[PDB]
Design a protein around this ligand. Structure first.
Ligand SMILES: [Zn+2]
Ligand SMILES: [Zn+2]
Length: 61
């Protein structure tokens, strides 16, 4: 499912469940996975700019 406007083009299936549907597409990364496979604690809906939880891990923090 499309998030709307994302930077990079990416798959329409979960890399975790290996199935699409209500997956979330990082607005920056070529990643695609459902919210539940990312984090059951993640409840904040992807509104427009949604960057994957992996994004913060790709930073030099
Ligand atoms: Zn999934
Ligand atoms: Zn990302």
């Amino acid at each position: 499912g499309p998030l709307g406007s994302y930077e990079t083009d990416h798959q329409d299936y979960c890399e975790v469940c290996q199935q699409g549907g209500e997956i979330i597409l990082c607005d920056t990364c070529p990643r695609a996975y459902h919210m539940v496979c990312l984090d059951p604690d993640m409840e904040k809906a992807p509104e427009g700019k949604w960057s994957c939880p992996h994004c913060e891990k790709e930073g030099i923090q």
